[PDB]
Amino acid sequence: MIQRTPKIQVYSRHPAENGKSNFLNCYVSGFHPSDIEVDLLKNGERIEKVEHSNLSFSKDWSFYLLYYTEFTPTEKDEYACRVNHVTLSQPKIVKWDRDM
């Protein structure tokens, strides 16, 4: 058996075709087993509507999740990714760096 803790990256992107759109992304990478729980948070509150969730694997024991949705950040709001996985004794919360 093998288990690996996910790497977690949280960042924003504007699609070049629609630049006034902004997306909040959580890239959760290289984890095993594939069982996982991943939420986007806004001011501590779970975001129910996340239109994109994109799972793949490389080696049979390495999984990759892109989790993202459109959003309209203000300098007031705090956003984060919250991840649960068997390798994590507590939920891991990664805050969005507003400049990323």
Author numbering: 0 to 99
Give me lines lifted from the publication on this model.
β2m tertiary structure consists of a seven-stranded beta-sandwich; according to standard nomenclature, β-strands are named from A to G, and loops are named after the neighbouring β-strands. The characterization of β2m structure and folding dynamics gained considerable resonance when the protein was found to be responsible for Dialysis Related Amyloidosis (DRA).
D53 is involved in the interaction with the MHC class I heavy chain; however, in the isolated β2m, it is totally solvent exposed and devoid of interactions with neighbouring residues. The D53-to-N substitution does not alter the regularity of the D-strand, as both D53 and N53 share the same region of the Ramachandran plot (Phi/Psi angles of residues 53 are -109°/113°, and -129°/98° for wt β2m and the D53N variant, respectively). D53 is the only wt β2m aggregation-protective element (namely an inward-pointing charge) at that edge of the four-stranded β-sheet, according to the analysis by Richardson and Richardson. Their overall 3D-structures are maintained without rearrangement of the loops or of the secondary structures; even locally, the mutations are quite well accepted, with minimal rearrangements of neighbouring side chains.
